[PDB]
Ligand binder design. Structure first.
Ligand SMILES: COc1ccc(CN(Cc2nc3ccccc3c(=O)[nH]2)C(=O)Nc2ccccc2)cc1
Ligand SMILES: [Mg+2]
Ligand SMILES: [Zn+2]
Length: 313
Protein backbone atom coordinates (compact mmCIF):
# COMPACT_ATOMS: atom_id res chain seq x y z
CA UNK A 1 0.00 0.00 0.00
CA UNK A 2 2.85 2.44 0.95
CA UNK A 3 4.86 1.17 -2.14
CA UNK A 4 4.79 4.00 -4.76
CA UNK A 5 6.38 3.76 -8.22
CA UNK A 6 8.80 6.69 -8.77
CA UNK A 7 10.54 7.67 -12.02
CA UNK A 8 13.86 9.41 -12.69
CA UNK A 9 13.53 13.25 -12.52
CA UNK A 10 13.42 13.86 -16.34
CA UNK A 11 10.63 11.20 -16.78
CA UNK A 12 8.79 12.33 -13.57
CA UNK A 13 8.53 15.85 -15.18
CA UNK A 14 8.08 14.97 -18.90
CA UNK A 15 5.48 12.15 -18.30
CA UNK A 16 2.95 14.91 -17.31
CA UNK A 17 3.28 16.54 -20.79
CA UNK A 18 1.13 15.42 -23.78
CA UNK A 19 4.23 14.97 -26.06
CA UNK A 20 6.13 12.54 -23.73
CA UNK A 21 7.78 9.60 -25.55
CA UNK A 22 7.99 6.48 -23.27
CA UNK A 23 11.55 5.67 -24.56
CA UNK A 24 13.24 2.54 -26.00
CA UNK A 25 13.64 0.62 -22.66
CA UNK A 26 10.76 -1.96 -22.83
CA UNK A 27 11.38 -3.08 -19.18
CA UNK A 28 10.47 0.45 -17.90
CA UNK A 29 7.02 0.55 -19.67
CA UNK A 30 5.09 -1.57 -17.08
CA UNK A 31 6.35 0.70 -14.24
CA UNK A 32 5.48 3.85 -16.28
CA UNK A 33 1.87 2.53 -16.66
CA UNK A 34 1.62 1.63 -12.92
CA UNK A 35 3.01 5.13 -12.08
CA UNK A 36 0.22 6.60 -14.29
CA UNK A 37 -2.59 4.47 -12.70
CA UNK A 38 -1.36 5.41 -9.16
CA UNK A 39 -1.39 9.20 -9.99
CA UNK A 40 -4.57 9.19 -12.20
CA UNK A 41 -6.67 6.74 -10.11
CA UNK A 42 -4.98 6.22 -6.70
CA UNK A 43 -2.61 3.68 -5.05
CA UNK A 44 -5.76 1.77 -3.83
CA UNK A 45 -7.56 1.49 -7.27
CA UNK A 46 -5.96 -1.96 -7.95
CA UNK A 47 -4.26 -4.71 -5.92
CA UNK A 48 -0.64 -4.19 -7.16
CA UNK A 49 -0.03 -8.02 -7.37
CA UNK A 50 -3.15 -8.47 -9.64
CA UNK A 51 -2.36 -5.29 -11.71
CA UNK A 52 1.29 -6.41 -12.30
CA UNK A 53 -0.02 -9.88 -13.37
CA UNK A 54 -2.71 -8.23 -15.62
CA UNK A 55 -0.08 -5.88 -17.26
CA UNK A 56 2.35 -8.77 -18.04
CA UNK A 57 -0.45 -10.97 -19.54
CA UNK A 58 -1.58 -7.97 -21.68
CA UNK A 59 2.07 -7.46 -22.84
CA UNK A 60 2.34 -11.19 -23.78
CA UNK A 61 -0.85 -10.95 -25.95
CA UNK A 62 0.57 -8.04 -28.08
CA UNK A 63 2.51 -9.35 -31.14
CA UNK A 64 5.96 -8.38 -32.53
CA UNK A 65 4.53 -6.16 -35.32
CA UNK A 66 6.15 -2.85 -36.40
CA UNK A 67 3.39 -0.48 -35.05
CA UNK A 68 0.35 -2.17 -33.36
CA UNK A 69 2.58 -3.51 -30.54
CA UNK A 70 3.11 -3.21 -26.76
CA UNK A 71 4.84 0.23 -27.16
CA UNK A 72 1.68 1.55 -28.98
CA UNK A 73 -0.51 0.25 -26.09
CA UNK A 74 1.54 2.10 -23.42
CA UNK A 75 1.89 5.24 -25.65
CA UNK A 76 -1.93 5.44 -26.09
CA UNK A 77 -2.43 4.87 -22.30
CA UNK A 78 0.01 7.77 -21.61
CA UNK A 79 -2.00 10.18 -23.88
CA UNK A 80 -5.20 9.17 -21.92
CA UNK A 81 -3.24 9.82 -18.65
CA UNK A 82 -2.33 13.39 -19.86
CA UNK A 83 -6.03 14.09 -20.82
CA UNK A 84 -7.35 12.74 -17.45
CA UNK A 85 -4.69 14.69 -15.44
CA UNK A 86 -5.47 18.02 -17.27
CA UNK A 87 -9.29 17.44 -16.74
CA UNK A 88 -9.18 16.38 -13.02
CA UNK A 89 -12.87 16.93 -12.02
CA UNK A 90 -14.66 15.96 -15.31
CA UNK A 91 -14.31 12.11 -14.94
CA UNK A 92 -15.78 9.67 -12.36
CA UNK A 93 -13.57 7.20 -10.38
CA UNK A 94 -14.84 4.29 -12.60
CA UNK A 95 -14.02 6.20 -15.86
CA UNK A 96 -10.38 6.89 -14.77
CA UNK A 97 -10.04 3.14 -13.84
CA UNK A 98 -11.76 1.96 -17.09
CA UNK A 99 -10.06 4.25 -19.68
CA UNK A 100 -6.35 3.64 -18.77
CA UNK A 101 -7.06 -0.13 -18.92
CA UNK A 102 -9.12 0.35 -22.15
CA UNK A 103 -6.11 2.12 -23.79
CA UNK A 104 -3.58 -0.54 -22.68
CA UNK A 105 -5.89 -3.30 -24.10
CA UNK A 106 -7.36 -1.46 -27.15
CA UNK A 107 -5.16 -3.28 -29.79
CA UNK A 108 -4.68 -6.67 -27.96
CA UNK A 109 -3.54 -9.49 -30.36
CA UNK A 110 -3.38 -7.13 -33.41
CA UNK A 111 -1.88 -8.94 -36.46
CA UNK A 112 -0.80 -5.71 -38.25
CA UNK A 113 -3.74 -5.93 -40.75
CA UNK A 114 -6.83 -3.68 -41.20
CA UNK A 115 -10.49 -4.77 -40.85
CA UNK A 116 -10.62 -4.50 -44.74
CA UNK A 117 -7.74 -7.00 -45.27
CA UNK A 118 -9.40 -9.52 -42.80
CA UNK A 119 -12.71 -9.26 -44.81
CA UNK A 120 -10.95 -9.63 -48.21
CA UNK A 121 -8.83 -12.56 -46.86
CA UNK A 122 -12.10 -14.10 -45.48
CA UNK A 123 -10.36 -14.47 -42.06
CA UNK A 124 -12.47 -16.36 -39.44
CA UNK A 125 -12.67 -13.16 -37.25
CA UNK A 126 -14.52 -11.42 -40.20
CA UNK A 127 -17.32 -14.11 -39.92
CA UNK A 128 -17.47 -13.82 -36.08
CA UNK A 129 -17.57 -9.92 -36.13
CA UNK A 130 -19.02 -8.33 -39.34
CA UNK A 131 -18.13 -4.69 -38.37
CA UNK A 132 -15.31 -3.30 -36.17
CA UNK A 133 -13.72 -6.79 -36.65
CA UNK A 134 -10.34 -6.32 -34.88
CA UNK A 135 -11.89 -4.01 -32.20
CA UNK A 136 -14.52 -6.63 -31.13
CA UNK A 137 -11.54 -9.11 -30.99
CA UNK A 138 -9.50 -6.64 -28.80
CA UNK A 139 -12.43 -6.35 -26.31
CA UNK A 140 -12.89 -10.19 -26.40
CA UNK A 141 -9.12 -10.63 -25.60
CA UNK A 142 -9.40 -8.07 -22.73
CA UNK A 143 -12.33 -10.00 -21.09
CA UNK A 144 -10.40 -13.35 -21.51
CA UNK A 145 -7.33 -11.86 -19.68
CA UNK A 146 -9.54 -10.39 -16.86
CA UNK A 147 -10.93 -13.97 -16.28
CA UNK A 148 -7.47 -15.67 -15.89
CA UNK A 149 -7.03 -16.71 -12.18
CA UNK A 150 -5.43 -13.79 -10.20
CA UNK A 151 -5.95 -11.29 -13.12
CA UNK A 152 -9.31 -9.69 -12.07
CA UNK A 153 -8.16 -6.12 -11.21
CA UNK A 154 -11.89 -5.12 -10.82
CA UNK A 155 -12.60 -7.86 -8.14
CA UNK A 156 -13.32 -5.22 -5.38
CA UNK A 157 -16.06 -3.46 -7.51
CA UNK A 158 -19.77 -4.18 -6.75
CA UNK A 159 -21.66 -6.25 -9.43
CA UNK A 160 -23.11 -3.02 -11.03
CA UNK A 161 -19.77 -1.06 -10.89
CA UNK A 162 -18.08 -4.12 -12.56
CA UNK A 163 -20.82 -4.10 -15.28
CA UNK A 164 -20.41 -0.27 -15.77
CA UNK A 165 -16.55 -0.40 -16.08
CA UNK A 166 -16.65 -3.34 -18.60
CA UNK A 167 -19.23 -1.25 -20.54
CA UNK A 168 -16.87 1.82 -20.46
CA UNK A 169 -13.98 -0.42 -21.74
CA UNK A 170 -16.14 -2.08 -24.50
CA UNK A 171 -17.40 1.28 -25.93
CA UNK A 172 -13.86 2.82 -25.52
CA UNK A 173 -12.22 -0.07 -27.48
CA UNK A 174 -14.97 -0.08 -30.21
CA UNK A 175 -14.51 3.75 -30.64
CA UNK A 176 -10.86 3.08 -31.79
CA UNK A 177 -12.36 1.75 -35.09
CA UNK A 178 -11.50 4.85 -37.19
CA UNK A 179 -14.52 4.01 -39.48
CA UNK A 180 -16.76 5.10 -36.51
CA UNK A 181 -14.71 8.28 -35.70
CA UNK A 182 -16.01 10.42 -38.67
CA UNK A 183 -19.71 10.19 -37.66
CA UNK A 184 -18.90 10.46 -33.92
CA UNK A 185 -16.92 13.73 -34.37
CA UNK A 186 -19.59 15.29 -36.72
CA UNK A 187 -22.31 14.56 -34.09
CA UNK A 188 -20.07 16.08 -31.32
CA UNK A 189 -19.39 19.10 -33.63
CA UNK A 190 -23.20 19.69 -34.15
CA UNK A 191 -23.91 19.20 -30.38
CA UNK A 192 -21.12 21.66 -29.32
CA UNK A 193 -22.12 24.36 -31.92
CA UNK A 194 -25.93 24.16 -31.19
CA UNK A 195 -25.11 24.08 -27.41
CA UNK A 196 -27.02 20.75 -26.85
CA UNK A 197 -23.78 19.03 -25.57
CA UNK A 198 -24.50 17.81 -21.98
CA UNK A 199 -21.82 15.81 -20.02
CA UNK A 200 -24.57 14.51 -17.59
CA UNK A 201 -26.24 12.78 -20.62
CA UNK A 202 -24.67 9.24 -20.75
CA UNK A 203 -24.94 8.99 -24.63
CA UNK A 204 -23.05 12.37 -24.77
CA UNK A 205 -20.29 11.15 -22.36
CA UNK A 206 -20.00 7.95 -24.46
CA UNK A 207 -19.43 10.17 -27.57
CA UNK A 208 -16.84 12.35 -25.71
CA UNK A 209 -14.93 9.25 -24.43
CA UNK A 210 -15.02 7.89 -28.05
CA UNK A 211 -13.29 11.05 -29.40
CA UNK A 212 -10.78 10.89 -26.45
CA UNK A 213 -9.95 7.27 -27.55
CA UNK A 214 -9.44 8.40 -31.20
CA UNK A 215 -7.22 11.31 -29.92
CA UNK A 216 -5.06 8.96 -27.75
CA UNK A 217 -4.95 6.36 -30.58
CA UNK A 218 -3.68 8.95 -33.14
CA UNK A 219 -1.29 10.64 -30.61
CA UNK A 220 1.78 9.78 -32.84
CA UNK A 221 0.87 13.01 -34.78
CA UNK A 222 1.08 15.09 -31.50
CA UNK A 223 4.72 14.23 -30.58
CA UNK A 224 7.91 16.22 -31.38
CA UNK A 225 8.70 16.03 -35.13
CA UNK A 226 11.51 13.39 -34.82
CA UNK A 227 9.12 10.99 -32.90
CA UNK A 228 6.24 11.71 -35.40
CA UNK A 229 8.52 11.09 -38.45
CA UNK A 230 10.10 7.85 -37.04
CA UNK A 231 6.66 6.51 -35.86
CA UNK A 232 5.26 7.14 -39.42
CA UNK A 233 7.94 4.65 -40.73
CA UNK A 234 6.53 1.93 -38.37
CA UNK A 235 2.92 2.68 -39.45
CA UNK A 236 3.88 2.48 -43.21
CA UNK A 237 5.95 -0.72 -42.52
CA UNK A 238 2.60 -2.40 -41.51
CA UNK A 239 0.60 -0.71 -44.33
CA UNK A 240 3.06 -1.79 -47.10
CA UNK A 241 3.12 -5.43 -45.78
CA UNK A 242 -0.74 -5.33 -45.94
CA UNK A 243 -0.43 -3.91 -49.50
CA UNK A 244 1.96 -6.80 -50.39
CA UNK A 245 -0.68 -9.27 -49.02
CA UNK A 246 -3.46 -7.51 -51.03
CA UNK A 247 -1.26 -8.05 -54.18
CA UNK A 248 -1.00 -11.78 -53.18
CA UNK A 249 -4.88 -11.95 -53.09
CA UNK A 250 -4.84 -10.36 -56.65
CA UNK A 251 -6.20 -6.96 -55.43
CA UNK A 252 -4.30 -3.67 -56.18
CA UNK A 253 -3.95 -2.03 -52.73
CA UNK A 254 -4.91 1.67 -52.20
CA UNK A 255 -1.81 3.91 -52.70
CA UNK A 256 -1.48 4.34 -48.85
CA UNK A 257 -0.51 0.59 -48.64
CA UNK A 258 1.48 0.29 -51.94
CA UNK A 259 5.24 0.45 -51.16
CA UNK A 260 5.78 1.37 -54.89
CA UNK A 261 4.05 4.76 -54.11
CA UNK A 262 6.37 5.82 -51.17
CA UNK A 263 6.90 9.15 -53.08
CA UNK A 264 3.18 10.05 -52.36
CA UNK A 265 3.66 9.71 -48.50
CA UNK A 266 4.18 13.46 -47.75
CA UNK A 267 0.97 14.45 -49.68
CA UNK A 268 -0.87 11.45 -48.10
CA UNK A 269 0.16 12.77 -44.60
CA UNK A 270 -1.38 16.24 -45.45
CA UNK A 271 -4.71 14.46 -46.32
CA UNK A 272 -4.63 12.53 -42.99
CA UNK A 273 -3.84 15.68 -40.89
CA UNK A 274 -6.63 17.72 -42.62
CA UNK A 275 -9.29 14.88 -42.86
CA UNK A 276 -8.67 13.07 -39.51
CA UNK A 277 -6.07 14.44 -37.03
CA UNK A 278 -6.76 18.28 -37.02
CA UNK A 279 -10.59 17.87 -36.90
CA UNK A 280 -10.19 15.29 -34.05
CA UNK A 281 -8.01 17.51 -31.76
CA UNK A 282 -10.04 20.70 -32.72
CA UNK A 283 -13.35 19.13 -31.52
CA UNK A 284 -11.54 17.64 -28.47
CA UNK A 285 -10.10 21.14 -27.62
CA UNK A 286 -13.61 22.72 -27.94
CA UNK A 287 -15.09 20.11 -25.48
CA UNK A 288 -11.98 19.83 -23.19
CA UNK A 289 -10.04 23.12 -23.42
CA UNK A 290 -6.92 21.88 -21.52
CA UNK A 291 -6.16 19.31 -24.37
CA UNK A 292 -5.17 22.33 -26.62
CA UNK A 293 -1.46 21.26 -26.53
CA UNK A 294 -2.43 18.13 -28.64
CA UNK A 295 -4.01 20.43 -31.33
CA UNK A 296 -0.94 22.76 -31.26
CA UNK A 297 1.58 19.85 -31.66
CA UNK A 298 -0.61 18.34 -34.46
CA UNK A 299 -0.57 21.70 -36.37
CA UNK A 300 3.26 21.91 -35.81
CA UNK A 301 3.59 18.39 -37.40
CA UNK A 302 1.28 19.38 -40.35
CA UNK A 303 3.69 22.33 -40.99
CA UNK A 304 6.70 19.89 -40.90
CA UNK A 305 5.00 17.62 -43.54
CA UNK A 306 4.32 20.77 -45.64
CA UNK A 307 8.11 21.57 -45.36
CA UNK A 308 8.94 17.96 -46.50
CA UNK A 309 6.84 18.51 -49.71
CA UNK A 310 8.54 21.92 -50.40
CA UNK A 311 11.94 20.03 -50.43
CA UNK A 312 13.08 21.93 -47.24
CA UNK A 313 13.48 18.41 -45.62
C1 LIG B 1 0.30 9.26 -38.36
O1 LIG B 1 0.91 8.41 -39.32
C2 LIG B 1 0.13 8.02 -40.39
C3 LIG B 1 0.76 7.14 -41.30
C4 LIG B 1 0.04 6.70 -42.41
C5 LIG B 1 -1.29 7.11 -42.62
C6 LIG B 1 -2.05 6.65 -43.84
N1 LIG B 1 -2.68 7.78 -44.50
C7 LIG B 1 -1.88 8.81 -45.12
C8 LIG B 1 -1.66 8.54 -46.63
N2 LIG B 1 -0.46 8.14 -47.05
C9 LIG B 1 -0.28 7.88 -48.40
C10 LIG B 1 0.98 7.41 -48.87
C11 LIG B 1 1.16 7.16 -50.23
C12 LIG B 1 0.11 7.36 -51.14
C13 LIG B 1 -1.13 7.82 -50.70
C14 LIG B 1 -1.34 8.07 -49.34
C15 LIG B 1 -2.65 8.57 -48.86
O2 LIG B 1 -3.62 8.88 -49.58
N3 LIG B 1 -2.77 8.71 -47.46
C16 LIG B 1 -4.08 7.97 -44.52
O3 LIG B 1 -4.79 7.46 -43.62
N4 LIG B 1 -4.63 8.73 -45.55
C17 LIG B 1 -5.88 9.38 -45.42
C18 LIG B 1 -6.13 10.49 -46.28
C19 LIG B 1 -7.37 11.14 -46.18
C20 LIG B 1 -8.34 10.72 -45.26
C21 LIG B 1 -8.09 9.63 -44.42
C22 LIG B 1 -6.87 8.95 -44.50
C23 LIG B 1 -1.90 7.97 -41.72
C24 LIG B 1 -1.19 8.42 -40.60
MG1 LIG C 1 -6.90 -0.53 -33.30
ZN1 LIG D 1 -4.33 1.65 -31.64
Amino acid sequence: GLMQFTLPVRLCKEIELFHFDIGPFENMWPGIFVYMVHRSCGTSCFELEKLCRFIMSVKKNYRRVPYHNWKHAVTVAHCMYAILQNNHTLFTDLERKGLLIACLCHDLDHRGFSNSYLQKFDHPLAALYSTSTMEQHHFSQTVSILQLEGHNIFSTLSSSEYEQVLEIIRKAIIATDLALYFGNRKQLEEMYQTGSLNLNNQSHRDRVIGLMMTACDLCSVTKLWPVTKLTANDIYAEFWAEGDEMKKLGIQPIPMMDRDKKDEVPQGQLGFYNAVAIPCYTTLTQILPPTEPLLKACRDNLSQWEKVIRGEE
